[PDB]
Design a protein around this ligand. Sequence first.
Ligand SMILES: [Zn+2]
Lengths: 189, 94, 172, 68, 52, 191
Amino acid sequence: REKKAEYFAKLREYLEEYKSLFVVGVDNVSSQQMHEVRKELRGRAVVLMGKNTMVRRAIRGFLSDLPDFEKLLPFVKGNVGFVFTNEPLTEIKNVIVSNRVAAPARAGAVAPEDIWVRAVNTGMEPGKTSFFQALGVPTKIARGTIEIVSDVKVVDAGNKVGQSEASLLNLLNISPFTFGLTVVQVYDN
Amino acid sequence: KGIKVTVQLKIQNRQAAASVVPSASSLVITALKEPPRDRKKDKNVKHSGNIQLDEIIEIARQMRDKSFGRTLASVTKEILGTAQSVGCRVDFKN
Amino acid sequence: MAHFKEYQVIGRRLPTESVPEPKLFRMRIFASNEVIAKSRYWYFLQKLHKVKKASGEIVSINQINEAHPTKVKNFGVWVRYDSRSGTHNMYKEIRDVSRVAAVETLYQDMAARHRARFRSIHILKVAEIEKTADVKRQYVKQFLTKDLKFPLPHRVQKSTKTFSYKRPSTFY
Amino acid sequence: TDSIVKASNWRLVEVGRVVLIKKGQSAGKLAAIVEIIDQKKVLIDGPKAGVPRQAINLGQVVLTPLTF
Amino acid sequence: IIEPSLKALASKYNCDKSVCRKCYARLPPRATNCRKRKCGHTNQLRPKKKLK
Amino acid sequence: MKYIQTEQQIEVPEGVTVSIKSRIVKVVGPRGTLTKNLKHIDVTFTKVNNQLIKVAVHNGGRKHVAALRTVKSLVDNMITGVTKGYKYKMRYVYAHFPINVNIVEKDGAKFIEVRNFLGDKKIRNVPVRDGVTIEFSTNVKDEIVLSGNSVEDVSQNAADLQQICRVRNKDIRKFLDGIYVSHKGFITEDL
RNA sequence: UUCAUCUAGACAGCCGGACGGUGGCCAUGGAAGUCGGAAUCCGCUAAGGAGUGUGUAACAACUCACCGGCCGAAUGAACUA
Ligand SMILES: [Zn+2]
């Protein structure tokens, strides 16, 4: 073994006493927010993911924890694992219904949706003054403030963003990585 | 309270700063124990000592942006005496 | 240096009249005939024990043939030699008929590929491996499938005379 | 609308094939090539036309279109 | 002044490709040996120096 | 190490049609027929059933059995290329000077050229094979879109249009002006 | 040869991560994750360093060692002659 040095006492004591399961299925996930929203309310529930033998976990743990192992195999997809529970989802959609915070895909890699400009009150100043100061948007320093009056047509879908152009969208701290933490698999009591 | 390289997590509100210090760790022995953390800072190093220092383990991550999740008692053996070398007072020194 | 033979040679190290009846060593030797076989005995045994040929004799020379020279059997052979930078062991595997016929086509690539020769090779034990498909050099495991079909292309024909009239075809 | 390739038709050497010796002692009598031993040599035994069961090579026999 | 992504479109074909430290040819930026015979497919490859 | 026998899986779709004598290939697909020549590799092919093709170099060496995977990918490209073909994105660049690549037709031979490249006075010229037919990306500016049913004769007729533009006796990592090729594609939709 | 994997699913690839403190001490005009001296991180995990290479003078922006998902079985290193 190079990869499974400690896997027998990995989760064959974790789900040993747990019968009502909430699941997680994702690739659109962070780390910084992610494993520290693994630090959300822990103390009675544990968080983990499986790996390659989740294709075999249909026939690894066949020791009949609960006799409904048809509900176990065909979701070996994504960063998929186990966030256990006792009681149902009656208040679990009162916490993580719309949670997100991130940096975008790498240095200005792909991002699905579209933004739009609007005359609002921001009031910025020339900081690192080599980003966007002559590209057509008005950085007209209005005796202290900045109020945009233009309607630009740049933002598209499926982008591979260049040098300084990935800190114009990131000037507004925009992250397309939503993932309100879902529960997709039906398994209880 | 401190003169070290001050991290700022400061969302300002009507000129009033966020009056808790995110506290670059310049006041971890010089508070009520020996002066050599901030006092005597340009005479020699501050990696000196393994002496009986503290058992105030609760307050330790109450200052520096509490992010343990599971156990804060694993981090209380782990900055003062590990990230520094002035006071640890236990032989988990590895 | 022929098609090889295999022998047992029974050495004894001449009876001392302080303590007679010595200990009767026995080997297994590959040899082109019976009288290179005797001189391979006093060259392997002089690495083990305190003898020489003027200090011993040969009790008997019993030529062996195989009990089944008519089946096939995958072999695994340990040899050691010295190419000119140093002495080296190691191993080969031959898919061949009998124990004597394998060591030819064991020596007939170790002389061709690593360019050693017969005064340097020291065969350790010609092991007939136990069954099929539990062997480790995979280039004999070309030959371990069911329905082993292959055609050989390009059937060249011999020339009895020196003027064909035909522009020869090579259908097989 | 036709996806044809020509023949791919040779003779083949199969386990238990018939074959025709051409040189040596046997000299033009029908063997039966039973079992491959290597790429350049095989086993033959057709022992109703007076041949023993020895390992022969393939630079010495030619092949017939019969197969059983 | 060109587009910085079109600068990066140009960058794959000319700018960042490795070079043999013995026969000076352009080598593709991950490559163990070289590709030719007067260097003997050698195993020293400096990267291509930038404009700082 | 003298491999015994080797076959693989060349797929044939429903419309294209492959009939081969000795080892040359005839192919007719939905977008204009072709034929090519491969008489240097010593293989044999077998259609099994209407959609799949074998290759075989049995009693091959080791440099033989590298050249079967290469003709898993020398006859597929014409199978795709007779029902897709190749489509090209070749973005321009200007550092100080424009570029007007436009298809003049001298001698009725349809030769593509380029003026005004880095302030030059030579009129460049490129010989243009058949198969291809130059079009430009209209109103999404300064690219070239090269069609065709061939595979080598499109990206040698593209690769020898992005290497005329070499600037010489200067730096090449500042003088980034030239002609480069952005992304080749297939002319069919979603590609 | 000598090791480690190897249908508990491997490698090459591709989807997404890669940190909260801490901008750990010293040395610093300026050391932050990637100029440096000395040691030699917790939490959880799938796992992330008191950092494998870039980048601001110093912040930050990236690739990464390090990983969970699609294919899905054979793969990698150091030596030898
Ligand atoms: Zn070279």
